């Protein structure tokens with residue numbers, strides 16, 4: 529529905545390699561060895577969760593989807609250092625999103 533207008537913006541994020549790679553599944557702190565992650569990031573989000581919410585009709589307005597996208601970005605800028613790989617990958621996704629979402633959010 530509105531799913532149809534938003535889906536391409538989400539595909540644009542997925543298509544970034546390798547920059548989407550830290551963002552494809554939920555952060556798995558046990559596996560990565562980062563036990564402080566849930567102390568810092570109170571509300572985790574990732575592409576796989578946004579894609580499920582999108583497919584199951586959980587975004588009723590466009591701002592709800594944009595909110596989860598930026599929750600994913602803001603979480604990563606918070607947790608990771610400015611000098612870090614994952615922080616820089618997040619910056620690239622945010623550039624790509626700005627480009628894709630703007631004309632969609634006009635139409």
Ligand SMILES: CC(=O)N1CCc2[nH]nc(Nc3ccccc3)c2C1
Nearest residue numbers: 549550551555560603604607608614
């Ligand atoms: C998104 C985020 O804030 N993560 C916590 C730190 C971190 N370190 N490494 C990752 N995940 C990752 C990095 C490169 C490739 C695949 C997964 C992550 C995920």
